[PDB]
Ligand binder design. Sequence first.
Ligand SMILES: [Zn+2]
Length: 196
Amino acid sequence: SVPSQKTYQGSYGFRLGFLHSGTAKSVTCTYSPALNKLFCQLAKTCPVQLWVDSTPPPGTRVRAMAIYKQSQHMTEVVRRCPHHERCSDSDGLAPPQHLIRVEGNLRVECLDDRNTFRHSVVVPYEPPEVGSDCTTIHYNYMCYSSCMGGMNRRPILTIITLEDSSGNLLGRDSFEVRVCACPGRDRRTEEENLRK
Ligand SMILES: [Zn+2]
C-alpha cells in the first residue's frame, strides 16, 4: 500500500505555498520551485502555506505524511532512525518515531495507522486571519536525509492532504524534502545541476 501523491486542488482550490527564503549559506529552510523541493536543517521551523479559493467547511483538517520518493522504497514506512527515535527530544505530543512534527499547535493529532503503520500528523484547518490571505502550518523534520537506519540518504516526499471530518479527500499537494546541514548551498547545487 502506497498513499497517492496525485496533485488535486478539489472543490476548494487547495494548493500549497512556500516563502521565498533565498540560498544564503546561513538559511535554515528554503524552497525550490524548479525542483518542487524543500531544503531544511534538522528540526528547524518549515513554514508551509495553505491556499484555497473558497473556505472549506468547519471540521476540515490538514494531514502531513512522508513517503519515500523512489518506487522501490515506497512501501517502506518513513520513520526516524534508531538514534533519533531514542534521543528523548519529545515535545510531549509527537511520538519519538515520527519524522514530521507540527510546531506550536495544541490541537495536533499524531496518527499511527492501524493498518499501514504509517505515521501522519493532522491539525484542524483554520481560515486565514484578518490581514492574511492564507494560513500557515509550521513543520519540523526530525532526522537528516542521511540518517543511517532511517531515511538512509533516500529522498522523501511530504504529502499534504486537505480532508473532511471523516478523513475523506478534499485536496492534495506534495513536495520533495531534503533535510541537510546547508540547505542554501544544496538548493543552489541541485538547481545548477538541473540547468546543466
Ligand atoms: Zn536520524
